[PDB]
Amino acid sequence: SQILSCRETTLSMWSQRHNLRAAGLTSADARLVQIRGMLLSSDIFRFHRARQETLNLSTALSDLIPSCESLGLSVDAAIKMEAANALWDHGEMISSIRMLQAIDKDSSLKKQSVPLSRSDLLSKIGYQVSVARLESPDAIQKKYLEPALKELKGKIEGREAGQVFHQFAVFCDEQLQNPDSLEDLARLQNLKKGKDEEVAQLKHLAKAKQWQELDQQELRRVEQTRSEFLKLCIENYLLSLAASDEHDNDALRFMALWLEKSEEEVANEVVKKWINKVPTRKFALLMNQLSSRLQDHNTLFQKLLIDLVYRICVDHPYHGMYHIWTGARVAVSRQRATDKIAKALSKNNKVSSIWPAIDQTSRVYHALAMDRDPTRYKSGQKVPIKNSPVGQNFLSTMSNNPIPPPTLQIEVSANLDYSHVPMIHKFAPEMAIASGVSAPKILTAIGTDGRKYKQLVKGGNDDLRQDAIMEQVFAAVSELLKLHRETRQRNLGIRTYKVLPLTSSSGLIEFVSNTIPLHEYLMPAHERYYPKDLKGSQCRKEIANAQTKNTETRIAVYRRVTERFHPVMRYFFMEYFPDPDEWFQKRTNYTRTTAAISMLGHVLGLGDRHGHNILLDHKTGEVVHIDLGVAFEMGRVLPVPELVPFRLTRDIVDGMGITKTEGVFRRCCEFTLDALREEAASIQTILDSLRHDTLYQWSISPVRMAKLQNSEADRAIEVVKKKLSKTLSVMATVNDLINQATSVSNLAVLYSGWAAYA
Ligand SMILES: Nc1ncnc2c1ncn2[C@@H]1O[C@H](COP(=O)(O)OP(=O)(O)OP(O)(O)=S)[C@@H](O)[C@H]1O
Ligand SMILES: [Mg+2]
Numbered sequence: 031s032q033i034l035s036c037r038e039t040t041l042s043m044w045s046q047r048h049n050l051r052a053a054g055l056t057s058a059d060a061r062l063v064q065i066r067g068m069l070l071s072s073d074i075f076r077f078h079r080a081r082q083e084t085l086n087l088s089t090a091l092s093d094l095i096p097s098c099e100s101l102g103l104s105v106d107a108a109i110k111m112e113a114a115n116a117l118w119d120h121g122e123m124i125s126s127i128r129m130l131q132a133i134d135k136d137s138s139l140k141k142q143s144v145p146l147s148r149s150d151l152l153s154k155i156g157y158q159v160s161v162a163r164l165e166s167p168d169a170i171q172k173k174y175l176e177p178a179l180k181e182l183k184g185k186i187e188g189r190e191a192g193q194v195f196h197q198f199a200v201f202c203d204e205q206l207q208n209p210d211s212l213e214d215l216a217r218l219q220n221l222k223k224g225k226d227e228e229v230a231q232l233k234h235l236a237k238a239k240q241w242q243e244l245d246q247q248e249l250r251r252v253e254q255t256r257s258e259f260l261k262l263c264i265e266n267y268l269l270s271l272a273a274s275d276e277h278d279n280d281a282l283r284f285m286a287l288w289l290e291k292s293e294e295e296v297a298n299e300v301v302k303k304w305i306n307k308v309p310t311r312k313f314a315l316l317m318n319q320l321s322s323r324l325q326d327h328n329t330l331f332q333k334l335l336i337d338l339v340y341r342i343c344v345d346h347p348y349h350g351m352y353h354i355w356t357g358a359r360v361a362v363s364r365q366r367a368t369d370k371i372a373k374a375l376s377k378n379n380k381v382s383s384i385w386p387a388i389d390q391t392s393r394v395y396h397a398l399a400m401d402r403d404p405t406r407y408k409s410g411q412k413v414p415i416k417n418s419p420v421g422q423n424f425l426s427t428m429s430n431n432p433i434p435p436p437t438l439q440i441e442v443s444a445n446l447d448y449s450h451v452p453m454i455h456k457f458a459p460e461m462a463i464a465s466g467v468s469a470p471k472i473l474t475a476i477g478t479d480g481r482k483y484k485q486l487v488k489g490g491n492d493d494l495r496q497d498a499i500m501e502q503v504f505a506a507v508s509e510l511l512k513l514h515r516e517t518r519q520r521n522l523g524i525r526t527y528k529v530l531p532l533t534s535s536s537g538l539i540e541f542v543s544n545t546i547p548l549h550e551y552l553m554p555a556h557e558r559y560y561p562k563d564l565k566g567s568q569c570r571k572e573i574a575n576a577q578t579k580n581t582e583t584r585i586a587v588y589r590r591v592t593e594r595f596h597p598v599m600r601y602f603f604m605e606y607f608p609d610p611d612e613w614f615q616k617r618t619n620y621t622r623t624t625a626a627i628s629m630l631g632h633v634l635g636l637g638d639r640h641g642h643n644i645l646l647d648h649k650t651g652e653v654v655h656i657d658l659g660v661a662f663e664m665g666r667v668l669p670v671p672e673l674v675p676f677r678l679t680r681d682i683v684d685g686m687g688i689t690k691t692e693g694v695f696r697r698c699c700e701f702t703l704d705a706l707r708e709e710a711a712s713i714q715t716i717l718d719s720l721r722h723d724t725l726y727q728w729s730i731s732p733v734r735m736a737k738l739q740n741s742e743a744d745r746a747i748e749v750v751k752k753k754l755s756k757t758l759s760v761m762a763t764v765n766d767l768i769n770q771a772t773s774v775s776n777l778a779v780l781y782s783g784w785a786a787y788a
Contacts, residue, residue: 104142149181192274199266268304399489399536435483437540452477484541494537496659549641574782588778597684616651623652625698637665662746678771
């Protein structure tokens with residue numbers, strides 16, 4: 031605000047003082063520059079939601095119009111549009127709409143400086159008239175949207191056309207999923223059904239048949255209207271994706287809309303016509319959903335889907351070829367189709383030194399994962415990977431085939447240039463081993479640029495596709511958080527990692543760089559700082575013995591245990607960051623990331639939040655949540671249910687200081703939850719894309735349910751949708767959540783492996 035106000039003063043004074051200016055700078059030039067600087071400041075003030083400053087600016091701009099018309103400037107349209115924006119942002123919807131319509135009626139948008147295209151004005155009026163319900167959705171399309179598409183004049187590239195096409199596509203989509211129109215279609219369908227049943231009962235007949243035919247004609251009209259809307263929706267989504275990059279979650283919405291209509295040949299003809307102009311970098315992150323619908327059926331849907339998956343794997347190989355490999359090496363048809371795509375991939379010129387590399391490398395990674403020997407691999411040791419035959423074959427094969435580390439997160443390149451990606455140079459000679467049955471081994475790889483990429487080569491009978499899908503969903507929602515001022519100002523978001531499933535029994539997990547598990551810090555620290563307290567194992571055993579007793583005894587035992595167990599988390603920051611400046615910044619990072627993941631894991635039902643799934647990053651302070659596969663409330667179905675919204679035990683809360691909760695954690699919870707329920711449409715779109723994934727399981731299979739404690743899509747998405755309801759205020763919702771997350775009667779009846787005493 032300070033810089034922008036001083037800039038306003040500067041530009042106005044320079045425009046007034048004619049003798050200070052140079053020779054060839056007339057007063058029209060100074061005036062025009064002043065106006066442009068003011069309009070820029072108005073954009074900036076609008077995002078900050080500073081109402082009074084946009085009001086001041088638009089008033090001071092409207093006062094310049096008389097003195098601008100005498101200098102020979104035509105800046106009335108841009109300034110009146112700024113006034114209309116101020117009105118709309120103060121709540122005057124009808125006044126803003128009337129002002130924009132007056133701009134459109136009597137103004138020459140062609141011959142005037144500070145240009146203003148007629149199609150963006152028309153689409154602005156159309157958007158505002160739709161929001162205010164000021165006209166029927168059949169006149170909005172006839173007066174504002176189709177005239178806008180006609181004003182583009184065949185230009186199908188740029189941000190102007192991107193805005194127009196996204197406007198029109200969202201309008202048509204909104205017309206399809208309309209509760210009134212769906213009720214009307216259902217009513218006409220029941221009428222047709224009942225009248226046909228009555229006619230069958232009879233075979234009076236003449237009039238009955240005539241009424242039946244009139245019903246049929248009405249139903250044909252309604253269905254044809256819906257078919258036109260579907261055509262326009264799909265076509266304009268595809269044209270908006272091909273024009274600009276402003277709207278790129280239109281790829282997720284187009285994909286959901288197209289997978290719902292895989293049989294309606296109308297949709298497939300429109301897609302066939304327009305699909306080849308979208309850059310494949312828009313679909314690159316949707317390969318879990320695309321490669322799950324592959325089949326060999328010779329239809330048109332499959333001939334489009336297979337070609338799209340092929341082009342994605344050719345342009346961005348490190349984003350599609352592992353999906354193809356996993357798919358090759360209704361399940362039989364999917365495997366056959368993925369095998370055909372793989373055979374075609376190992377035939378073309380662009381990707382031919384890349385597909386064999388990934389082939390051989392994945393084979394040896396899987397072989398190394400599956401190889402368990404209790405003698406050759408002792409849990410906790412550190413074995414040089416040259417003594418097993420699998421180890422030597424692995425090292426040789428990896429030396430002969432250079433690839434980027436499979437757990438490195440590669441960003442998608444618009445220029446299609448993946449040469450700047452570090453390849454695996456060599457492997458560290460040894461590999462660690464963790465405790466389990468099928469020994470998870472932690473490899474290290476030294477890359478070309480000289481960094482160390484550690485990896486968990488996880489083998490056994492686990493399902494990493496759940497964890498990978500949920501990591502992708504959480505990353506998408508955290509990306510939604512960046513669009514709002516309050517959460518973006520605080521960098522509220524989650525830390526991601528990379529899961530890569532190789533087969534149905536093995537995967538590569540990214541070993542997060544310099545973290546430490548929460549339980550592995552907390553259990554030694556508890557006895558280092560309080561040598562007279564109970565041990566972690568004594569508390570766990572004491573709580574597990576009273577697991578088959580009444581709630582009164584369980585709560586009494588829990589109080590007795592936590593009276594002899596004091597939190598020590600506040601020391602994690604006093605012993606990794608002794609400098610007060612750094613200590614304060616890192617403790618704030620911890621609090622903010624804990625708040626963001628608490629709200630985000632309440633909204634998505636995230637469970638299984640024990641100490642071994644939470645990592646503490648001792649370089650930046652901020653927590654990382656891994657193992658995100660038990661989501662959508664699957665955790666309160668277990669034998670000993672997890673009935674808390676998130677993990678907020680005494681140690682998580684002790685890491686926050688004098689102000690236990692009231693402070694940074696509560697304000698950040700409220701900003702997160704306030705930004706989440708203003709993106710409920712986008713979260714619905716993400717979960718809808720999840721709904722068309724044939725391989726995602728919406729219930730926890732008794733295998734993992736036994737590994738954890740020693741329509742389902744419709745119910746889950748409905749629960750998510752009612753957690754984002756604006757009925758209660760954010761303050762009251764967060765108060766309730768923090769009351770039930772820290773309650774002793776809730777924490778006392780949790781499973782003993784969920785270390786709640788801690
Ligand atoms: N991707 C990862 N990055 C960094 N550390 C990890 C990662 N995955 C697991 N860890 C940690 O390294 C160890 C590996 O844990 P695992 O033995 O694979 O599974 P686990 O969670 O320990 O077993 P349970 O069922 O939870 S008792 C644990 O101490 C984890 O905290
Ligand atoms: Mg784990």
